[PDB]
């Protein structure tokens, strides 16, 4: 069954950076080109009388996802295209004991969710039923591993060369409204051999039973998008990325990348080139309409 | 599968003996690109894809890098930097019947060429002229697919061939290795080595580098391997060159 539930920006700062590969480096500044969340970009802030808005978002070239909660409301995500039984979709769900990742032709609900209730005797929250999809078939992939969903959880989702790559970080915070400032790189979580087309995704939330009453009365996260950017990453003595420069952020960051350093000395540096780009395409061919007699060659009676 | 709708099989986390296939007498074509067929068992890959389909004899040459034609352009395209092996054999005794086997289709018309490993299985009417077809075939409006109609009496060029293309991916830990027997790990000596496909010469010592759980090897400022994770013990080893210098 399905339930019909449908009835702001923050600063990304210097977060959303992940280890670009699986190579150990130390005490070195490494320049890499990959899909990263641009520094100081506009990250959309979602908040799912009753009001419910947990929309399907574009995947674009990859997604930066973050949440700040101690209630374990965010349980998973749906990644796909039409998000119905017509095409294959990737379903990632966390629960009490493990993470289940499946690829099937899922017939997803418009407002997919996991039910949770407060057990009056145990005095704790417990799982009830899934209301994510009405049916699933033609399953091609299944994977099960360890669980990972003032507590900031960050994820990066990429879909490159058949691999659905997930990076993650778990950091304690003292913020309520905005994401924290400072630098912390996300580590590879899993490389999934999924091999599917993804253009849209949706967040799976655990909804309290009390919200499912028939009356009109009785879950925040951040989404950014990755871009093809050049980053200068600083690896410390233990091979941890502790800082980074977005080479396209501003003229100083560009200088820092050019000089392969996080510091710049007094002076004037040649860092880039300027060029005006064309806005139109002008085609001027001879104004003739007669066609070339090629057919007369191909359909000749005799060769 | 039909070539217009070729079937891709993903192979991983296994031992790949390619000598069984290469030394077989049962294949008519076995052409490798980017790799020698006799060195395959010494290599490790991060993934192998086995793409299977049926085409007619004359079209077997189109299953290669740098080719053009109805198959190369509209059905199954291989990249110019393809690494892998194209294996084919005559299947006239399997895929042909009296009266013609019309279960094998190929794409005859398309708006543009396919990208490498693109799989187009649409059946939308192809517009050859300037006038919209509106889903109706007729003059200047063609049904994009056609059958081979394989018959047991056809000449070789028109007999069915079963083609399997093994693409070798080299990203990522290698998961598909040849059937090579491992040796004991030796440290504090000048040795040749091969760590999950990573070859070289040098001295292996215990590393004090803080490798993360996902990292398989490291590199110095020269961007060359200077440390590896042993694929069996998960021990981190530093690699230095064997003593050398001018004389």
């Amino acid at each position, epitope marked *: 069954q399905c339930v019909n539930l449908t009835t702001a920006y923050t600063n990304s700062f210097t977060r959303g950076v992940y280890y670009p590969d699986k190579v150990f480096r130390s005490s070195v500044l490494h320049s890499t080109q990959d899909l990263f969340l641009p520094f100081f970009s506009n990250v959309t802030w979602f908040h799912a009388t009753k009001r419910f808005d947990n929309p399907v978002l574009p995947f674009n070239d990859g997604v930066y996802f973050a949440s700040t909660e101690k209630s374990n409301i965010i349980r998973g995500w749906i990644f796909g295209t039409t998000l119905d039984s017509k095409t294959q979709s990737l379903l990632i769900v966390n629960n009490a004991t493990n993470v289940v990742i499946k690829v099937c032709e899922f017939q997803f609900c418009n407002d997919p969710f996991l039910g949770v209730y407060y057990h009056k005797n145990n005095k704790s929250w417990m799982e009830s039923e899934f209301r994510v999809y009405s049916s699933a078939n033609n399953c091609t992939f299944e994977y099960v591993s360890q669980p990972f969903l003032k507590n900031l959880r960050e994820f990066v989702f990429k879909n490159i060369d058949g691999y659905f790559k997930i990076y993650s970080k778990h950091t304690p915070i003292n913020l309520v409204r905005d994401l924290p400032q400072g630098f912390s790189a996300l580590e590879p979580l899993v490389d999934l051999p999924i091999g599917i087309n993804i253009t849209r995704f949706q967040t799976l939330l655990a909804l309290h039973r009390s919200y499912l009453t028939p009356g009109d009365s009785s879950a925040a996260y951040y989404v950014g998008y990755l871009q093809p950017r050049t980053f200068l990453l600083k690896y410390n003595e233990n091979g941890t990325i502790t800082d980074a420069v977005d080479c396209a952020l501003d003229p100083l960051s560009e200088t820092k990348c050019t000089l392969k350093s996080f510091t710049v000395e007094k002076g004037i540096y040649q860092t880039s080139n300027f060029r005006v780009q064309p806005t139109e395409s002008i085609v001027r061919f001879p104004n003739i309409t007669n066609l070339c007699p090629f057919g007369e060659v191909f359909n000749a009676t005799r060769f | 599968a039909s070539v217009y709708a070729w079937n891709r099989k993903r192979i991983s986390n296994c031992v790949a003996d390619y000598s069984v296939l290469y030394n077989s007498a049962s294949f008519s074509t076995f052409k490798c690109y980017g790799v020698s067929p006799t060195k395959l068992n010494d290599l490790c890959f991060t993934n192998v894809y086995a793409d299977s389909f049926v085409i007619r004899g004359d079209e077997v040459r189109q299953i290669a890098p740098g080719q053009t034609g109805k198959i190369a352009d509209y059905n199954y395209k291989l990249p110019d930097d393809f690494t892998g092996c194209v294996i084919a054999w005559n299947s006239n005794n399997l895929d042909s019947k009296v009266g013609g086997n019309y279960n094998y289709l190929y794409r005859l018309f398309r708006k543009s060429n396919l990208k490498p490993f693109e799989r187009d299985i649409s059946t939308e009417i192809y517009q050859a002229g300037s006038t919209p077809c509106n889903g109706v075939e007729g003059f200047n409006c063609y049904f994009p*697919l056609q059958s081979y109609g394989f018959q047991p009496t056809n000449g070789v060029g028109y007999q069915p061939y079963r083609v399997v293309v093994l693409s070798f991916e080299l990203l990522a830990p290698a998961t598909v290795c040849g059937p090579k027997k491992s040796t004991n790990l030796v440290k504090n000596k000048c040795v040749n080595f091969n760590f999950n496909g990573l070859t070289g010469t040098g001295v292996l010592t215990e590393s004090n580098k803080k490798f993360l759980p996902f990292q398989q090897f490291g590199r110095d400022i020269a961007d060359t391997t200077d440390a590896v994770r042993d694929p069996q013990t998960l021990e981190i080893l530093d690699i230095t060159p064997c003593s050398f210098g001018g004389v």
Partner: antibody, heavy 122, light 104 residues
Framework: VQLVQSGAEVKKPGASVKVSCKASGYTFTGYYMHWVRQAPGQGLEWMGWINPISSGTSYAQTFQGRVTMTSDTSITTAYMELSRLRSDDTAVYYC??????????????????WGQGTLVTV | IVMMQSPGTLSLSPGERATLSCRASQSVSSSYLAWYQQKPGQAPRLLIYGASSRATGIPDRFSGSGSGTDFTLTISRLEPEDFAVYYCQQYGSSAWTFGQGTKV
């Protein structure tokens, strides 16, 4: 190239007739199968065609709405079903082969092979 | 379109030459003009296509020519087997049209 049609049929007005045509000696789906009618003492009249690869059809405005063409590639056979038969449908029906519309040298503009005529009396 | 053949009936001795004409109410591409031969009790067979090209198996005694709205079929020497009904056929507007036929 051979085209072999079913035997003669006798029908009452309002009845339907289905005439088959089994093809051999060529790639069945490589050609369009056309049907042409010839009433006694009359000339040849084109009815329509079917493209076996997709079972796509086109009919003359004269027969459109009465005739349905189908095919089965597994037995390389084409069928023409003419419904609501009238007394003026008494004719010899032929199946004929022609190239598809994508033929460069306009082999679709004519019929190069014909089956034996099948007489239907109404 | 209307395809009109003439004469409705043609009669001459074996060994002689016969000319069969087909006229169109509108211009017809030479590529779309064909001639057929139908013997008594037999299905039509293709003789000429593309106005002038002989079909496979057709004797060089048969030839065709023409353009626009005037096409002909020529039998240089008539044999006993040539005394049949001939048709002209046209393609256009996604339709196939036959003439009324003429008897030799």
């Amino acid at each position: 190239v051979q085209l072999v049609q079913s035997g003669a049929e006798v029908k009452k007005p309002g009845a339907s007739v289905k005439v088959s045509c089994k093809a051999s000696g060529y790639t069945f789906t490589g050609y369009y199968m056309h049907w042409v009618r010839q009433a006694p003492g009359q000339g040849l009249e084109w009815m329509g065609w079917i493209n076996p690869i997709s079972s796509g059809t086109s009919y003359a405005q004269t027969f459109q709405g009465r005739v349905t063409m189908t095919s089965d590639t597994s037995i390389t056979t084409a069928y023409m079903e003419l419904s609501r038969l009238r007394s003026d449908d008494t004719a010899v029906y032929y199946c004929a082969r022609a190239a598809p519309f994508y033929d460069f040298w306009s082999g679709y503009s004519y019929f190069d092979y014909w089956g034996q005529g099948t007489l239907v009396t109404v | 379109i209307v395809m009109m053949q003439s004469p409705g009936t043609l009669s001459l001795s074996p060994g002689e030459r016969a000319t069969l004409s087909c006229r169109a109410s509108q211009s017809v591409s030479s590529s779309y003009l064909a001639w057929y031969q139908q013997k008594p009790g037999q299905a039509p067979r293709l003789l000429i296509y593309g106005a002038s090209s002989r079909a496979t198996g057709i004797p060089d005694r048969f030839s065709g020519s023409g353009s626009g709205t005037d096409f002909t079929l020529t039998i240089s020497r008539l044999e006993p087997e040539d005394f049949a009904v001939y048709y002209c056929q046209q393609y256009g507007s996604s339709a196939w049209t036959f003439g009324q036929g003429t008897k030799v």
